[PDB]
Structure 1
Amino acid sequence: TDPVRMYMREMGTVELLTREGEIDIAKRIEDGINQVQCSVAEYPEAITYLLEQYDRVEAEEARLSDLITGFVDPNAENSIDPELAREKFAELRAQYVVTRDTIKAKGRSHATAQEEILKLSEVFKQFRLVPKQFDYLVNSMRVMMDRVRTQERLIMKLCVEQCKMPKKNFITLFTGNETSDTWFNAAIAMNKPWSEKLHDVSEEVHRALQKLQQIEEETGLTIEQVKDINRRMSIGEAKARRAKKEMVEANLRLVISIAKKYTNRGLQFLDLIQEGNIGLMKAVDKFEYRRGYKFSTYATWWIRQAITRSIADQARTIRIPVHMIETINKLNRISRQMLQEMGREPTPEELAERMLMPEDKIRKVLKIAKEPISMETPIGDDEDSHLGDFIEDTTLELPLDSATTESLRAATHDVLAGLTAREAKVLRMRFGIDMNTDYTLEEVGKQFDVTRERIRQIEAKALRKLRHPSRSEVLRSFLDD
């Protein structure tokens, strides 16, 4: 086989790092996550979102799980108690208004304001979020970044390309000011051939800046402050993810050692390693360097968890649940015991006693535990034949029976023709003959001019004439079926 050989040669180049070498990578992981957490704390909308989504679940009475478990999780500087949940989100709301009056006065972050913003970040770092709720907070900065650089690209499109302008003059004007319109109209005041020809598209350049300058009022930070955090956030995300790769790459040899034992079960050899590598992903994300224990012991449990879960979920054609798999494994262990202790073979009456389960349960599982047989199983060969060749189709109706159904409808049509006019219409509605819908006794009465009780009389009258041997000799032949 080809795919098995070169995989061992790809990870063979990467050497194993042990002891203090593991900590060097582990330190970059936690510092990488913390740098991202600092970027979320600096963002003003994240403080608003944490107060907005808190009132979404708290207003719907006191709960315990689902959404509240994703939030809270506090650390002072499991079922979460309502006493502390109301307590921790209380000072955050108080810090939202006190660190706002200093921003409106003078500059954005002026001396005293800078002291309170750093105080505001300390309150935000107190909370820890579950990945489910943590992802959208990052998306509140990822999608909004695709609104700042995209609109600036539109400004650059209708000035540098449309008006044919050098890129040197754009550096000083679109960095020092950014906010005001002292770069758009100020360039025309110098009087230049490529500066005066900007009036042709003036209704699109600084007008589109209202989808950029409005962000300063939407979020609470200037263009200088928005780009400073978003670009810094991408650093921490690249810090952790790339360091987690090095931890996985070095411990790929540990995955193979565990995967070789579970080969005779069902799944292919390479499928066990690839699923085991996904188990190694969980063994790094939840791992800490503050644990003070061996990485190999913690990784083995997570790698084995991924293999054991997939080995029962997949492998077989018909899927067998986790609880049902455990009973099949229990059957095989006692079958080895009872065969040689007694003498011959364990009977369903005797096998049910040691399992502490009723006879109707064991005899049911034995049928489910059997793997479906292959289609091309050779039986005797000689003239070359398979199992799938001798299997008959029961879905198809016989051509003799198909002709009988056609003959029955043709016979009944001549039978209904012999009836006295209205007698045929009733039976064709009561039994749905030659009609799409089947009608009830109440439905005919209102659509046949006659009363309700009379319908029962003429129905039996029509039947009696067809119960006669002289008239219905052809219909009596269909009674054989």
Structure 2
Amino acid sequence: RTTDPVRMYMREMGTVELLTREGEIDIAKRIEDGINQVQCSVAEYPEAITYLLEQYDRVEAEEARLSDLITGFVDPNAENSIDPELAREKFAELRAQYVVTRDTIKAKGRSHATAQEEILKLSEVFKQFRLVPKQFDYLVNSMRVMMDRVRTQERLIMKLCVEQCKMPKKNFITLFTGNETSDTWFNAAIAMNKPWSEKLHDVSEEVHRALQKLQQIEEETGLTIEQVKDINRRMSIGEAKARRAKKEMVEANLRLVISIAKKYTNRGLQFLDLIQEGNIGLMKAVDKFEYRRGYKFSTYATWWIRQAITRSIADQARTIRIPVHMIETINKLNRISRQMLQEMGREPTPEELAERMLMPEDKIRKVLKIAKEPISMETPIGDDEDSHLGDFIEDTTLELPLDSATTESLRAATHDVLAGLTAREAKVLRMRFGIDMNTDYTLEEVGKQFDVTRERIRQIEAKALRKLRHPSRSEVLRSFLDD
């Protein structure tokens, strides 16, 4: 009756053993094959080829860079610090196969063997270019949707015709796939003298209109139809290959994964979280690996996973997030502390390590202030179960009814005092400071409501002090002087 999915997953990974050393190279073979065969799917295209120099001169004409993108782009594997001269070379030849390919695709049509192999050469000169990051994927999202549009029109007309007709489908497909341009099938369907087809014949003007927007997308997209209809499936298959083949490798080295994981299963976080992040670091080691380097695969992901773990625990694993830099320097600290202990035989001081760590006591004492964790309200610091620590804290925000009485008696005396003032000025003194309002009026607006004069108001401040301060009403203020 085991409740622990630790057992579940160690058992079910127990299904799969380790497969190595040609499966390493044979998943690789199937996948590089799928890659080069999606690129053969790219070797085929029609006018759809109006693609490469377009979105490539998109990046050339505006001073193509050598920052992140070309660290993504071609960078061929040698079975570099990119030259700005070889780039300028590479921005001239590709324009030629394109243009010599256009009219030769317009020469008699598309079925032409020499032209076909010149387009295979166009691929070949494309096929020196690796299958490289996002703008490619975006250029492929293009196709991912254009296919779906093609199938959208299919779905639309399959609905409209096949769901309605519902007996007559055979002859429809026959004469339609036959003719496909003119309305020579309709009367060919109707030579059998069908009165309900006579009833429909009033709408034929709109039926071939419903075929008009069918055929409109043909211009709006520009397909060689069979050609694209092959290219789509070919690349679909070059995808499916790897999508299958890698899962083998993934299931293989699960035991390396779990093994390395269970070093840093000191009581830092938890089993399966380390395990999950190890799967992550793996799968990213999988996306990239070369057999060609001729090394054991283990080393590779042993780097990758290690990274993933090493900073995932640092990201997570605390109620306090600490950015990595502190984490690193804490590692410096903790390691060097111990060397200095051996050297010393005792605990080294903040200054001694301010010297040796190479940074000043500021940052020492600083970090020393920082590195501790929260201690969980529900602890019974009452040794007997009488007091969990949550009780003894204070609520230091809210309110004092005593001070409420204080301020209320104050404001009462305030307005009681303001009652004994000049009426010309009473108004002013109200609005000048925002008494009895949500407002803050101090200046020119007052100048227009009452009188543009502004600094005789100041003289009247002096007045009011004299009217009030000289012991007339001071005594009731002075009880609030202690406030």
Question: What TM-score results when the alignment is normalised by the length of structure 2?
Answer: 0.89
Worse-superposed segment, 294-303 or 166-175: 166-175
Note the alpha carbon deviations across 1:299-322, whole angstroms, 9 max, x for none: 211111111120101101111111
Whole-Å separation in 1 of the counterparts to 2:56 and 2:417: 77
SS at structure 2 position matched to 1:106: coil
Note if contact 1:70-1:133 (Cα within 8 Å) is conserved in structure 2: no
Worse-superposed segment, 40-49 or 145-154: 40-49
Note the alpha carbon deviations across 1:212-264, whole angstroms, 9 max, x for none: 53444344323322222112221111001111111101111110110000011
Note if contact 2:434-2:440 (Cα within 8 Å) is conserved in structure 1: yes
1:269 positional shift: 0.9
1:147 positional shift: 0.9
Worse-superposed segment, 158-167 or 214-223: 214-223
Q: Please, which of 441, 453, 476 is the counterpart of residue 451 of structure 1?
A: 453
Whole-Å separation in 2 of the counterparts to 1:441 and 1:476: 30
Whole-Å separation in 2 of the counterparts to 1:207 and 1:307: 62
Question: Residues 114, 215 of structure 1: CA spacing in aligned structure 2 closer, same or farther, 3 A cutoff?
Answer: farther
Question: Residues 468, 60 of structure 1: CA spacing in aligned structure 2 closer, same or farther, 3 A cutoff?
Answer: farther
1:285 positional shift: 1.2
Computed over aligned residues only, the root mean square deviation of the Cα atoms, in angstroms, reads 2.9
Note if contact 1:40-1:138 (Cα within 8 Å) is conserved in structure 2: no
Whole-Å separation in 1 of the counterparts to 2:423 and 2:331: 72
Note if contact 2:380-2:388 (Cα within 8 Å) is conserved in structure 1: yes
Question: Residues 428, 248 of structure 1: CA spacing in aligned structure 2 closer, same or farther, 3 A cutoff?
Answer: same
Question: Residues 250, 467 of structure 1: CA spacing in aligned structure 2 closer, same or farther, 3 A cutoff?
Answer: same
Note if contact 1:163-1:194 (Cα within 8 Å) is conserved in structure 2: no
Question: Residues 119, 184 of structure 1: CA spacing in aligned structure 2 closer, same or farther, 3 A cutoff?
Answer: farther
Whole-Å separation in 2 of the counterparts to 1:230 and 1:213: 20
Question: What TM-score results when the alignment is normalised by the length of structure 1?
Answer: 0.89
Question: Residues 178, 16 of structure 1: CA spacing in aligned structure 2 closer, same or farther, 3 A cutoff?
Answer: farther
Whole-Å separation in 2 of the counterparts to 1:336 and 1:10: 43
Note if contact 1:37-1:125 (Cα within 8 Å) is conserved in structure 2: yes
Aligned pairs for 1:353-392 (under 5 A) are 353-392=355-394
State the structure with bigger RCO (CA 8 A, min sep 6), 1 or 2.
2
1:27 positional shift: 0.9
Worse-superposed segment, 131-140 or 171-180: 171-180
Worse-superposed segment, 43-52 or 400-409: 43-52
- Could you tell me which residue of structure 1 aligns to residue 23 of structure 2? 21
Whole-Å separation in 1 of the counterparts to 2:416 and 2:57: 76
Note if contact 1:151-1:211 (Cα within 8 Å) is conserved in structure 2: no
1:408 positional shift: 3.3
Note the alpha carbon deviations across 1:420-469, whole angstroms, 9 max, x for none: 12323333344222233433445533443142321221123223434243
1:160 positional shift: 1.9
Question: Residues 71, 299 of structure 1: CA spacing in aligned structure 2 closer, same or farther, 3 A cutoff?
Answer: closer
Q: Please, which of 241, 253, 256 is the counterpart of residue 254 of structure 1?
A: 256
1:297 positional shift: 1.3
Note if contact 1:17-1:250 (Cα within 8 Å) is conserved in structure 2: yes
Question: Residues 224, 90 of structure 1: CA spacing in aligned structure 2 closer, same or farther, 3 A cutoff?
Answer: same
1:122 positional shift: 2.0
Gaps of 5+ in 1: none
Question: Residues 281, 101 of structure 1: CA spacing in aligned structure 2 closer, same or farther, 3 A cutoff?
Answer: same
Structure number with the higher helix fraction is: 2
- Could you tell me which residue of structure 2 aligns to residue 309 of structure 1? 311
Worse-superposed segment, 44-53 or 274-283: 44-53
1:166 positional shift: 3.3
Worse-superposed segment, 320-329 or 45-54: 45-54
1:404 positional shift: 3.0
Whole-Å separation in 1 of the counterparts to 2:393 and 2:203: 77
Note if contact 1:426-1:459 (Cα within 8 Å) is conserved in structure 2: no
Whole-Å separation in 2 of the counterparts to 1:197 and 1:76: 71
Note if contact 1:158-1:205 (Cα within 8 Å) is conserved in structure 2: no
Note if contact 1:416-1:424 (Cα within 8 Å) is conserved in structure 2: yes
1:400 positional shift: 1.9
* 4+ residue segments displaced more than 6 Å: 74-77
Question: Residues 219, 265 of structure 1: CA spacing in aligned structure 2 closer, same or farther, 3 A cutoff?
Answer: farther
1:392 positional shift: 1.2
